[PDB]
């Protein structure tokens, strides 16, 4: 829920509106492995699509977001 709110705030920031709350959140599209890239479908009324992606950098696992 804290992570979902950070995604929703990130989406509003990337679009820029003043974030009030998350109405609905669903994840879809990940391959069947731990730390697979996934799309969040957020209702906040607005509908946002936010990538949560993972990449290795110098044998460290990194996590980043993109507004779709």
């Amino acid at each position: 829920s804290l992570e979902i709110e950070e995604l929703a705030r990130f989406a509003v920031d990337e679009h820029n509106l003043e974030f009030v709350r998350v109405v609905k959140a669903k994840e879809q599209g990940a391959n069947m492995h731990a730390y697979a890239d996934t799309m969040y479908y957020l209702t906040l009324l607005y509908e946002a699509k936010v990538w949560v992606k993972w990449e290795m950098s110098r044998r460290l696992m990194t996590n980043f977001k993109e507004l779709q």
């Binding site: 391959n31 069947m32 730390y35 697979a36 890239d37 992606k53 993972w54 990449e55 290795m56 950098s57």
Partner: protein, 218 residues
């Protein structure tokens, strides 16, 4: 002939060859650089070099880097044209990509207005942009990725995508397209997948990827 050494299937078609089948093309119209390719002359205006065909599972697509660089298979049947060939063809001008999918009497397709493959030094880096069609935009996820096989992973991969998902592709983490995946494999993400058409738990019966100059549209 209008083009005595046709450099792709669109020049072969402009020469008056209108029947799908095997044709000799010549990279950069060089007589010394003959390549026998399968031309799809009937789909969506014709003039297409086919570079992937899946239709029955008879051919092995779970192959190493060298096989994907060189190409493998009977070009009349299931095959992969080879990444060196794709690099050299896409370097000749501005090519578009078409993907034809068929499954249990249903059909869909995707077109990408810009399609190119980098050289071996780039690990055959994919450029794929400008989606239209009915299959859904599953290649966008793969734009900018290097190629990977079970025996050559990337320094950015979380898991070995080719090993895990029984194929070879321009993987990220890992795919929304797996058209060189394992035939008939409905296990999550392991099969002949086009995510935005049939998802990760449905291996598609028939798939072709093909390319031609984008100016052929006009």
């Amino acid at each position: 002939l209008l083009y005595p050494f046709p450099k792709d299937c669109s020049q072969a078609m402009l020469n008056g060859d209108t029947t799908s089948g095997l044709y000799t093309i010549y990279l950069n119209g060089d007589k010394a650089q003959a390549l026998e390719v399968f031309c799809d002359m009937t789909s969506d205006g014709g003039g297409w070099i086919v570079f992937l065909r899946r239709k029955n599972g008879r051919e092995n697509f779970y192959q190493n880097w060298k096989a994907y660089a060189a190409g493998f298979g009977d070009r009349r049947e299931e095959f992969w044209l080879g990444l060196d060939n794709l690099n050299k063809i896409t370097a000749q001008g501005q090519y578009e990509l078409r993907v034809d999918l068929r499954d249990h009497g249903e059909t869909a397709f995707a077109v990408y207005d810009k399609f190119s493959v980098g050289d071996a030094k780039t690990r055959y880096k994919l450029k794929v942009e400008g989606y239209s069609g009915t299959a859904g935009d599953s290649m966008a996820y793969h734009n900018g990725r290097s190629f990977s096989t079970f025996d050559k992973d990337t320094d950015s991969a979380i898991t070995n995508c080719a090993l895990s998902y029984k194929g070879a592709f321009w993987y990220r983490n890992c795919h929304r397209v797996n058209l060189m995946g394992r035939y008939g494999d409905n296990n999550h993400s392991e099969g002949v997948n086009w995510f935005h058409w049939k998802g990760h738990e449905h291996s598609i019966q028939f798939a072709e990827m093909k390319l031609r100059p984008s100016n052929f549209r006009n």
